[PDB]
């Protein structure tokens, strides 16, 4: 097509620039640094009380409270030190697929197959957890939501579009388009000005917040993008594919940097998270257990088994003290 | 080693017993995933008694039925089908009228794709058949050869229904774990609900036996 021929040339020089700017690979650069060695992680607490499968969880800001969502229809705010239950929120549609806990510790939000994102108060005059406002306007299933402030949130749904909301009014302040199908994951930068999201077409994109227009795209996968993370520094991120290939991309270099694949693993990653320093790249595999990878050496450094079913969510506290994984086993575990 | 944390422990133990009661109240209910390809076929079977998932619940013979309709969601099927892992049965309604109007070939796939899936490996599939009367009138002039070149029997309502029943049942790939209950829908309301209740009762007994291990 002559009309699409210009787009073909555009892709030509962008690929040429990406190829030319790669004067050296990371793997040969990180050769003189000592490996971290084997890592032993043990179960400190085990938390029971969920009955159905667990799909998502989010660590609090103080690294002491966490919230989990399950198909049982209950949203539980655990106390991560004494394994006590703080709140139990009964839901309306028991098809939740994501949850988020406010940076200020005041709000908790979840969404699922009903295409509705609900905001819950936690500190009210009465001793009850009520619904602040239900956000509607998505034609597909809601996949992942992450808070920005107490008045602005960003949501990712299955209708190919990400949106930025406004709890006070409830109307979509900004809408992000450009993906082709089933935007799965979402993660935002520490400075809360840019965020990235993974799509089912195996192509991650970077969206600005104030501008409201896409800034950059990344490709290289083969099947899907089940979950994404974002490097603590803010210039890179790690993305979890569906063919046992975790990838670490880059923002300044605008290229794929390194891959984390093994011959034994054949399943698909379900969740990805980082550590406080950034040396350990944690991933949650479909093969009944989690894993830890060296962000530089790209070699396995420990198998964190102990689950009787696939892990569906993984998170690391703000202070980097513990690691908590949730699985379809319905048992939530916190490791150290 | 607890000054005021005892009250917190009491609260956590009480919102544990409340959750246990709520979860033991949700095991008596039966969850049925409605499916199909034709919106008209769904209607007749959602009519009987009482965006995204549109739930509908009814009570029959002191049994609480929970029926989920999911067809509305216009997205990839493989990204949320596993959320229905524990459904008791999968109601499947297809059209008998549409043998010509390859539309049945379309359904035949949607049945193959749903039946022998990676999930649903131990869930029975109730098979409803709709528009049997219009099928009876329109089968006189339209031979099955247009859509079924392999048909060799006579052109009559009885033989065609049995042949299409056998054709639908042939696509099953796990004959020792599933049970495709087939029924022809009639104008009488009560019969459809009775067939649904009878099929569900049989599945419940088999599920109970699997837990104890009498197999």
């Amino acid at each position, epitope marked *: 097509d002559e009309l699409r021929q210009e787009a073909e040339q555009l892709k030509n020089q962008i690929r040429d620039a990406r190829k030319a700017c790669a004067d050296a690979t990371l793997s040969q650069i990180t050769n003189n640094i000592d490996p971290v060695g084997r890592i032993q992680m043990r179960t400190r607490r085990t938390l029971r009380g969920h009955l159905a499968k667990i799909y998502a969880m989010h660590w609090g800001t103080d690294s*002491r*409270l966490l919230v989990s969502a399950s198909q049982d229809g209950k949203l539980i705010i655990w*106390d991560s030190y004494t394994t*006590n239950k*703080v*709140h139990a929120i009964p839901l309306r549609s028991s098809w939740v697929m994501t949850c988020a806990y406010a940076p200020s*510790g005041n709000y908790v939000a979840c969404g699922g197959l009903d295409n509705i994102c609900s905001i819950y108060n936690l500190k009210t*005059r*009465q*001793g*009850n957890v009520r619904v602040s406002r239900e956000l509607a306007g998505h034609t597909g299933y809601l996949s992942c939501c992450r808070f920005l402030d107490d008045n602005q949130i960003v949501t990712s749904s299955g209708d190919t579009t990400c949106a930025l909301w406004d709890i006070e009014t409830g109307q979509q302040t900004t809408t992000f388009t450009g993906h082709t199908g089933d935007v799965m994951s979402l993660s935002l930068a520490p400075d809360t000005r840019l965020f990235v999201s993974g799509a089912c077409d195996a192509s991650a994109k970077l969206w600005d917040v104030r501008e409201g227009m896409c800034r950059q795209t990344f490709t290289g996968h083969e099947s899907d993008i089940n979950a994404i993370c974002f490097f603590p520094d803010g210039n890179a991120f790690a993305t979890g594919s569906d063919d046992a290939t975790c990838r670490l991309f880059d923002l300044r270099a605008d290229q794929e940097l390194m891959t984390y694949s093994h011959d034994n693993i054949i399943c698909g990653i379900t969740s990805v998270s980082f550590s406080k320093s950034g040396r350990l790249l944690l991933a949650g595999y479909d093969d009944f257990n989690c894993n830890v990878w060296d962000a530089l050496k790209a070699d396995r450094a420990g198998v964190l088994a102990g689950h009787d079913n696939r892990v569906s969510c993984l998170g690391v506290t703000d202070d980097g003290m513990a690691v908590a994984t949730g699985s379809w086993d319905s048992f939530l575990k916190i490791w150290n | *080693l607890s*000054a*005021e*944390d*005892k*009250a*917190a422990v*009491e*609260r956590s133990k*009480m919102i544990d017993r409340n959750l246990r009661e709520d979860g033991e109240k949700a095991a008596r209910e039966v969850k049925l995933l409605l499916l199909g390809a034709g919106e008209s076929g769904k209607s007749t079977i959602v009519k009987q008694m009482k965006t995204g998932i549109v739930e509908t619940h009814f009570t029959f013979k002191d049994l609480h039925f929970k029926m989920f309709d999911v067809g509305g969601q216009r997205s990839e099927r493989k990204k949320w089908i596993h959320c229905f892992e524990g459904v008791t049965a999968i109601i499947f309604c297809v059209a008998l009228s549409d043998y010509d109007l390859n539309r049945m070939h379309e359904s035949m796939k949607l049945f193959d794709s749903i039946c022998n899936n990676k999930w649903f490996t131990d869930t029975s599939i109730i098979l409803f058949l709709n528009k049997k009367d219009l099928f009876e009138e329109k089968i006189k002039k339209s031979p099955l050869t247009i859509c079924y070149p392999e048909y060799a029997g006579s052109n009559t309502y009885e033989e065609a229904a049995a042949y299409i029943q056998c054709q639908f049942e042939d696509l099953n790939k796990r004959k020792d774990t599933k049970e495709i209950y087939t029924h022809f829908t009639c104008a009488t309301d009560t019969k459809n609900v009775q067939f649904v209740f009878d099929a569900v009762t049989d599945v419940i007994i088999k599920n109970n036996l699997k837990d104890c291990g009498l197999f």
Partner: single-chain antibody
Framework: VQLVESGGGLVQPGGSRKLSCSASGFAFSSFGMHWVRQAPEKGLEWVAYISSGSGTIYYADTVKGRFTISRDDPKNTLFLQMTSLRSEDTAMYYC??????????????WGQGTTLTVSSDIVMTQATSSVPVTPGESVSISCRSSKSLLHSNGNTYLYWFLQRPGQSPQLLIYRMSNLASGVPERFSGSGSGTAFTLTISRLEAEDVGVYYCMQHLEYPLTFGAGTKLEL
């Protein structure tokens, strides 16, 4: 968020009486309830405590056995059973709510009061009696405890209370550091070990009142002598 109580009056010594606390406007089926007694022109003193889903009915030692406390969740009403009558038995009775979780703030709301006929435990005490004030500068109030309140958890269980002249008191500082909800930021509490001090940045017209202290490390809850902050 309104506590209404009734049942007070003048009775002959040796009799019995019924006090009922009516709660409307909040989830009363999840708040632990206490009774607080204030002798005329004297300080405060704990009486009883009843938890949510009554399983702990902790009592004061001076009224142990004689008094009986119960609750009725569906009707949202608290009951108190008194028998006999002594000098210490009679005072003004208050109805206080409290909820206990990780980040809760016990002793949020207080009732109105009632009237009757006549006039070891960590003994928190300070009594600086009266402090004359001028609206504007900063005034500090000191308190001393009979035991180290710093539990192994890393937090001290002491509460600060303010009672303006003419109505029920309210909570200002819980765990000697955290501000209550709705109070002005001018208040500031601090201290460690057994030496605690409460400081006010600037004095206003409405700050005049009597300041009390609680310890919550172990029952029974012990009040202080109470310091009046007059002009």
């Amino acid at each position: 968020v309104q506590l209404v109580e009734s049942g007070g009056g003048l009775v002959q010594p040796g009799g019995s009486r019924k006090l009922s606390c009516s709660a409307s406007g909040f989830a009363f089926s999840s708040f632990g309830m206490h009774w607080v007694r204030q002798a005329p022109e004297k300080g405060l003193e704990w009486v009883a405590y009843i938890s949510s889903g009554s399983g702990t009915i902790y009592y004061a030692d001076t009224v142990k056995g004689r008094f009986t406390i119960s609750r009725d969740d569906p009707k949202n009403t608290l009951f108190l059973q008194m028998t006999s009558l002594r000098s210490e038995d009679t005072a003004m009775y208050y109805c206080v709510r409290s909820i206990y979780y990780y980040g809760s703030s016990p002793f949020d709301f207080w009732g109105q009061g009632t009237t009757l006929t006549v006039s070891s435990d960590i003994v928190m005490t300070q009594a600086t009696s009266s402090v004359p004030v001028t609206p504007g500068e900063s005034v500090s109030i000191s308190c001393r405890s009979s035991k180290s309140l710093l539990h192994s958890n890393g937090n001290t269980y002491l509460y600060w209370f303010l009672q303006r002249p003419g109505q029920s008191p309210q909570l200002l500082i819980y765990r000697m550091s955290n501000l209550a909800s709705g109070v002005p930021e001018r208040f500031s509490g601090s201290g460690s070990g057994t030496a605690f001090t409460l400081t006010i940045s600037r004095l206003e017209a409405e700050d005049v009142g009597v300041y009390y202290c609680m310890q919550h490390l172990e029952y029974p809850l012990t009040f202080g002598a109470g310091t009046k902050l007059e002009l």
